Design a protein around this ligand. Structure first.
Ligand SMILES: Cn1ccc2ncnc(Oc3ccc(NC(=O)Nc4cccc(C(F)(F)F)c4)c(F)c3)c21
Length: 303
């Protein structure tokens, strides 16, 4: 059975993952939706003996019901199944004992979501480079792209699909490391511009077969990855500039309409975007192929 569609059968080994709520000092919110939220916190010795560590805690909030409670437990189970990889949100522990809220504790990614971050660095970017000390460069952008591909290749190896891949679901940590994540309930899709009534769906990131056939596969994730690449090389711009996301937009996508090259892209990266947007899912590159390709482009950029 699907590892992420039938996660209720997955194990939750409390002896390994349970963390005492009294060793968690909850702080300010990092993101909030209608029923869920992520809060910054200080965990004592969650990953290193007697060491304070800033972490992110995903949990529910006022408005949530038992259904969201069950959903959060499934999220915990799937994160345990997926396991650890440098480019995937890293689960550190959980608080599941009665008397308090269910809390999923993950590694804190200092810079938050990549979409917001990149959009904030427009005045701190140079293709190639003390004055530019903290400037982003093409190397950074290609590296982020490469890392997300690595994370998705890993996710695929765990027999899971993302279903909402986008820059808003990529976190940036220290040392230029990015991690794939899924805010889920910690974002209110019914109030977010990126989700449209079609049922709130991220239409601008969805492959044709997902929009018209409701089909979700790792190859539809590849299409989304292409849109993510566009977001990266546009430094956080919103996809399909000035385009009304309606029935006509979907029809045109089917026909072959694609976004033009973003301002900061290289010719190779734009071609990669177009490849990810092939109408036929089987003709789109696989994440393993993207890892190879992007790794080569990253190396080439250093030349
Ligand atoms: C908002 N925010 C700012 C800094 C920060 N650092 C870590 N996590 C954050 O928020 C989180 C985002 C998502 C999750 N959860 C999550 O990513 N679950 C999930 C569920 C199924 C699949 C996957 C994926 F790995 F496939 F993406 C992730 C989380 F706990 C905290 C942070």
């Amino acid at each position: 059975l699907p590892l992420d569609e039938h996660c209720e059968r997955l194990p939750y080994d409390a002896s390994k993952w349970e963390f005492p709520r009294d060793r968690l000092k909850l702080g300010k919110p990092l993101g909030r939706g209608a029923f869920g939220q992520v809060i910054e916190a200080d965990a004592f010795g969650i990953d290193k003996t007697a060491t304070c560590r800033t972490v992110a805690v995903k949990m529910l909030k006022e408005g949530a019901t038992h259904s969201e409670h069950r959903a959060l437990m499934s999220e915990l189970k799937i994160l345990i199944h997926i396991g650890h990889h440098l480019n995937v949100v890293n689960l550190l522990g959980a608080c599941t004992k009665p008397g308090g809220p269910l809390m999923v504790i993950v590694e804190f990614c200092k810079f938050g979501n990549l979409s917001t971050y990149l959009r904030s660095k427009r005045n701190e970017f140079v293709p190639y480079k003390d004055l530019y000390k903290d400037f982003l460069t093409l190397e950074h952008l290609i590296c982020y792209s490469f890392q997300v591909a690595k994370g998705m290749e890993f996710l695929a190896s765990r027999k899971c699909i993302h279903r909402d891949l986008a820059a808003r679901n990529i976190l940036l940590s220290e040392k230029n490391v990015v991690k794939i994540c899924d805010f889920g309930l910690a974002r209110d899709i019914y109030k977010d511009p990126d989700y449209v009534r079609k049922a709130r769906l991220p239409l601008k990131w969805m492959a044709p077969e997902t929009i018209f056939d409701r089909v979700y596969t790792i190859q539809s994730d590849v299409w989304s990855f292409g849109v993510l690449l566009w977001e990266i090389f546009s430094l956080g711009a919103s996809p399909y500039p000035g385009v009304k996301i309606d029935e006509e937009f979907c029809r045109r996508l089917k026909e072959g309409t694609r976004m033009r090259a973003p301002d900061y892209t290289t010719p190779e990266m734009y071609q990669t975007m177009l490849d990810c947007w092939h109408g036929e899912p089987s003709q789109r590159p696989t994440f393993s192929e993207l890892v190879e390709h992007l790794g080569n482009l990253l190396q080439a950029n250093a030349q």
